[PDB]
């Protein structure tokens, strides 16, 4: 299957992995016989594709909590919405 990197979060299976992360270009030094790397807590952060020495980072898809600002019911009925802790170029692609 063709490889789409950084286009969007995409669940995947390179060789025997759960995946479910967005992919990005990495520059970490990496030994030849090695296959993938776990940063901390045995969580896999970087993997290497068989088609090249190209290594790929893995980042979880963004999530957060939505909060509502309000000046009180009796005064007015406007509100404001704050999507916490997230770069917001994906706000229209929020399911909840």
């Amino acid at each position: 299957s063709t490889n789409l990197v950084k286009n969007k979060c995409v669940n995947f299976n390179f060789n025997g992995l759960t995946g479910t992360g967005v992919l990005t270009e990495s520059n970490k030094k990496f030994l030849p016989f090695q296959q993938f790397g776990r940063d901390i807590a045995d969580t896999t952060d970087a993997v290497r594709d068989p088609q090249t020495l190209e290594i790929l980072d893995i980042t979880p898809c963004s999530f957060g909590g939505v909060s509502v600002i309000t000046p009180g019911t009796n005064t007015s009925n406007q509100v404001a919405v704050l999507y916490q802790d997230v770069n917001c170029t994906e706000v229209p692609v929020a399911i909840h």
Partner: peptide, 24 residues
């Protein structure tokens, strides 16, 4: 039979996993 002591030779990469600047 001319016994000898192996000081610090006999270690090998247990897995093809990449780990950087950590103690495991």
């Amino acid at each position: 039979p001319a016994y000898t002591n192996s000081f610090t030779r006999g270690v090998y990469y247990p897995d093809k996993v990449f780990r950087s600047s950590v103690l495991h």
